[PDB]
Design a protein around this ligand. Structure first.
Ligand SMILES: O=C(CO)[C@H](O)[C@H](O)COP(=O)(O)O
Ligand SMILES: O=C(CO)[C@H](O)[C@H](O)COP(=O)(O)O
Ligand SMILES: [Ca+2]
Ligand SMILES: [Ca+2]
Ligand SMILES: [Ca+2]
Ligand SMILES: [Ca+2]
Ligand SMILES: [Zn+2]
Ligand SMILES: [Zn+2]
Ligand SMILES: [Zn+2]
Lengths: 219, 219
């Protein structure tokens, strides 16, 4: 199943990845960022509905100098004390946020359109694939509409969220290890259930993958 | 006229549409008074508008809670994270500054992104403010989260004319807690939904549609 998903990812398709019954119980739509298109963004906002985020392998984040947002906030809590009052000291270690900074490519206008978000994401994957790390500040500004996620060092060995699972899948596919993901939201106000997301994958001829399978394959 | 009609709609917990200006973003946001937000509002915003779902706060509330602008958090944190300096938004194309602030989740939510979770976070924030329980902010919320806050400029539309200021101004005029939730309407072609298409939406759904100039002049 993992290898079939890898082929789909290599063709620029959206695949569906469920994490686990014990974790978020959520399914994310996932695409290899180097193949992102405005159409992928349109499908994610209409049929998934969560935040459209782009996850990056830790090696990439280290080359760009991008930290976890929690660390930006903790340091800034020295000046803005409310940040200390909002510390996420109550989240299980396994669910600790993978949130990093938000960005827009400088050539975009408001940054939120399908065209703007696909351009921001595709240009970031381009810059990374080409190794033009120093061009990051030249080409992008923060804050913006595309939320970046920082994958755990060691990926699924140390954290088992969609952030790590999808980046691990891109690494396995021999692609730039950067993915764009969006949580699938249900009409009942909760996340779409695994039965509901498997159903959507069947209707749209998409690959549906369980996180356990990616983890096992990777390890 | 239409502004008074939009005010009555907000007081009833309905959504209104606000277009800023041809000379600014050229975008229409769906708008609702946060104290009346429901999971259904979040659902219609993600399916029918599609941009980010953000909650704008009157600067008075922001000062009482100690919530700063995000660019300021980044500016201060750049002392430690050098990448932040190179990402300065000294070039946002449609205004001097962004209204982006911190992101939050109410501590009682699970993943924070569902319609139920986002509506709960936003409504609870509006309630905490309405009840003057500012010392309870950290007790009830954590950052980062799925709900992005926006800080309205001091003087509102007298000093900045974004949807952030315009909508907070309408909530104030309505004698409501001045906190709004807004979402940009996106088009199928990859650009923001056109003025003509957002008008057709407003006519189909009998929603009040306002332009920025009318709100600014009335305020
Ligand atoms: O938080 C999220 C996006 O903002 C989603 O849960 C997304 O799937 C990435 O997070 P995680 O790695 O915890 O699954
Ligand atoms: O940026 C945005 C959301 O994050 C949107 O533009 C929203 O309408 C608020 O911004 P502004 O006050 O500039 O119109
Ligand atoms: Ca998560
Ligand atoms: Ca804006
Ligand atoms: Ca201005
Ligand atoms: Ca009508
Ligand atoms: Zn997830
Ligand atoms: Zn706007
Ligand atoms: Zn209707």
């Amino acid at each position: 199943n993992v290898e079939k998903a890898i082929e789909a990812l290599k063709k620029g398709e959206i695949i569906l990845v469920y994490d686990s019954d014990e974790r978020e119980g959520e399914t994310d739509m996932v695409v290899a960022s180097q193949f992102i298109t405005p159409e992928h963004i349109r499908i994610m906002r209409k049929d998934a509905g969560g935040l459209i985020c782009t996850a990056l392998h830790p090696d990439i984040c280290n080359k760009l100098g991008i930290p976890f947002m929690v660390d930006i906030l903790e340091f800034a809590s020295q000046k803005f004390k409310v940040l200390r009052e909002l510390y996420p000291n109550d989240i299980p270690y396994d669910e600790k946020s993978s949130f990093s900074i938000t960005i827009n490519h400088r050539k975009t206008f408001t940054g939120i359109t399908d065209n703007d978000r696909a351009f921001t994401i595709k240009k970031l994957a381009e810059l990374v694939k080409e190794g033009r790390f120093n061009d990051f500040g030249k080409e992008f500004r923060s804050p913006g509409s595309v939320t970046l996620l920082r994958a755990a060092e060691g990926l699924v060995k140390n954290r088992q969220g969609h952030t790590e699972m999808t980046v691990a899948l891109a690494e396995l596919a021999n692609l730039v290890p950067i993915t764009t993901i969006c949580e699938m939201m249900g009409d009942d106000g909760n996340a779409m259930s695994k039965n509901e997301t498997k159903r959507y994958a069947e209707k749209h001829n998409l690959i549906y993958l369980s996180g356990e399978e990616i983890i096992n394959y990777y390890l």
